[PDB]
């Protein structure tokens, strides 16, 4: 065991050791979503960094995790960072959606990982959780909810001017 | 009667609260509209702050009044702030229309009001409006109809692209 | 079903907008008070500015929730705000004795919702209550509730000097 | 009757008079440890300020737990402030093993405090603990339980040198 | 024995260390006074600032003695610290009667401790009081008198419309 | 194909894809290294930084590879980023002998790589890695074998004194 461990349960840190690779993938796809746009025939640069931002801000997410488990007597078990689902993510709107697809997910589990300490009696995990991560996605799911809305009304993916004026007046 | 009372009439006294409560309704629909534009299936953001500046203006109108009754001896008689019947606002263009519409009709109720002060021979209360109001809503319907003019001559409402570009360049 | 909605139960969404109107119930009636002492036959300075203040600090309190609807998938729904029944607040004492009632009503309403917030296991909302609301309406009852012991310790509402003194000096 | 109390069960106030004490039994327990290293026979001063800084946070602890007490109508019944059972804190290693051990037995008293505030429906304190008292001692449990290792890994008490090189590197 | 002990008896070490559970005992009384006017049925919070001010300068004299006790190679022997004798300080004047009463239970203590210094012939322990303690503990008796007198002459306690003028103009 | 491919083979473009992986296999190692050391049963603080910071720095080693592909109109195929070979880096002594074998492997992943641009006559490749990538990692091999020899003189591992001070002095 450890010396700082207290009110910490092995079925809880096991989910923490599960959230860790769950944040690492998002970064890895976000990151795949970045350079997808660096490409010549692709060529929307301001998309990318939006996905490079939230891949970078993604990295501090995965750290704050690692911090608690140490804060709390949990060791750290690392397995593999799987490869993305697609490498060709097609449509300038496909990405925002596929992004939204994965933001819902973290937010789900994060609301599943919340309830676990709701009944193993760990209200400390109900502060660093109820404060540092929820509204993170709630506004991220909120933002990518206005984003996808706009391309569509712009006429995306059938409009090509949609992903230019976006990549300028929303992402500039 | 009070102490500051002079020249003043029960009628115009009575009409201001009619013309006070409605600045709140105005701001309440400006507010109602403002956040309908936050919807995920909207993503019209400078449209939101537009009508949110307007509510905090049409709120100021309600304040830019209530002391005047206490500056002359009349007491305040408010009634129920009723909502609008168009909970959902269809299009920015359409919202401008209703916005315009009410403004146009809040306007006349200020014309109405002036015309009564003119009757009971109250030159001050005519110039409180002179100094503070009719010289303002005139300004409003001008660029209001200007907003139609663009979007209605751009291609909107059936142009979910013109809404995008009307905003990033007119609303801010 | 909005595309930004994940566990936002029907009762909760139908209750966020219940409070909002209640939230806008206060903002209105506070402002009734903010103009009783603007009455000439009343004439107390900073008893209108403390309420003018809240009347906008309740204004803001509502807006933090109309986002939340749109932020959790919820469609805002709007209702009639009713006029205050008290045409007169007698004296500045009973006023705060009516804002204590208010600030107290606002609480069990938060609670009974933060019950249902836990009911449908929406903790996002739960921590949201606790911050801008649970945490503030406590001291907003310690604040307002201190402004009452002294007033009657001074000698209000009988002796009318206490009102002069508390208006200048505590509010200075 | 207490004119501010509201959803504040009486079983919660009794365990706070009992807990404020507990955070004052540790300001004084710090106030011993802060001079045993002052003393010229040990003379570890960067040790001294540590437990003299700690002697101000845990005084700041028991002091916010009392502003709140009047902010919910809870009444403060003080009790005796007993000394500890140990006095010449053998080393610095051991002079921290107690500093930690004595605090773990505050989080536990807080975890059961969050627990008791849960069984009797009080989210204002549960959030109050959530924010002002949860992570802090996780920091402290971190702030101490690690030191212990480095202390141990250099060679204390086998080396009174360590307590010095640790003194003026870790604590300046 | 102490390598640094020189001309320092042991009733000295016993009476210093006897006169530290009297300077501190004052800190604990002022703080209860502080969180008495923190109360909602009292609600005067400059009284409280005051006694939080005596809560801490009379918390710094122990810091003098403890070093002093190690200045002089003596050891520290702590005991319990009682709660003060009242939990409800009755009134605002009467929290000042007693305040002027205890600093006289500590003056003559430190005065009739000033003699044993002369016994063991230890003028260090003499001059150490003739400035750093006794010059400023006969000031704090002087001021409370003016406070108590002002109190009994401003009309305490019969005139409740009074002891709030003192809370504002003198204490603030 | 590519509207910009030039002199840019298949076999060329190959390794880029699989070296991206490697600099991802590495930042993931420094990732865990940094937090093995953040464990209280290790607690060597600024050990964390050194390895954290070189995870943030060998991170950009990949992005700038994943940017070259694009530039020359290459194609990305991000494979899985696997788990670290050891999960308990024993001590600072081992947890650094690893970096050494590691970065030499990464280096020889490029010595034997760069010469592809040589057979395939990729001059833009024969200098980029020279300028942006090679020496930056020779300026990290040295940066470790200067700790590695330090710790063999400071008695590591058998001298657990050696680990504490390298923190504040070399890496503080
Ligand atoms: Fe997150
Ligand atoms: Fe309020
Ligand atoms: Fe409030």
Author numbering:
A (entry chain D), B (entry chain K), C (entry chain P), D (entry chain X), E (entry chain C), F (entry chain V): 5 to 176
Paper text:
In order to achieve the proof‐of‐concept objectives, we chose a 24‐mer human H‐chain ferritin (HuHF) nanocage as starting materials; subsequently its original Asp residues nearby the C3 symmetry axes were mutated into Phe, and the resulting mutant is referred to as 3FF. One ferritin molecule consists of six C2 rotation axes, four C3 rotation axes, and three C4 rotation axes. Here, by a combination of the multiple, symmetric interaction sites on the outer surface of protein nanocages and the tunable features of phenylalanine‐phenylalanine interactions, a protein engineering approach is reported to construct a variety of superstructures with shape anisotropy, including 3D cubic, 2D hexagonal layered, and 1D rod‐like crystalline protein nanocage arrays by using one single protein building block.
To confirm this view, a self‐assembly behavior of 3FF (2.0 µm) was investigated under the same condition as above except that the pH value of the solution increased to 9.5 (20 mm CAPS). As expected, 3FF molecules assemble into 1D rod‐like crystalline protein arrays in solution, which was not observed in the solution of wide‐type HuHF and other mutants under the same experimental conditions. Thus, anisotropic π−π interactions have an outstanding performance in the assembly of 3FF molecules upon changing solution pH from 7.5 to 9.5. The arrangement of the 1D crystalline protein arrays mediated by C3 vertex interactions roughly resembles the bct lattice, but the unequal offset distances of parallel C3 axis make the structure markedly different from the above 3D crystalline protein arrays where all contacts at vertices are identical. The results revealed that the A‐type interactions are strongest among six types of Phe‐Phe aromatic interaction, followed by C‐, F‐, D‐, E‐, B‐type analogs. Joint‐A is mediated by two pairs of Phe‐Phe interactions, one (F123Ab‐F123Bb) of which possesses a T‐shape conformation, and the other (F123Ac–F123Bc) is offset stacked. Structure analyses revealed that the 3FF monomers jointed by the A‐type interactions penetrate along the c‐axis in a right‐handed‐helix manner with four monomers per helical turn. A bundle of such protein nanocage helixes join together along the ab‐plane through relatively weak π−π interactions, resulting in the production of the 1D rod‐like crystals. Collectively, all these results demonstrate that with Phe‐decorated 3FF molecules as building blocks, pH is able to serve as a switch to control conversion of isotropic intermolecular π−π interactions to anisotropic interactions, finally realizing shape tunability to its 1D analogs.
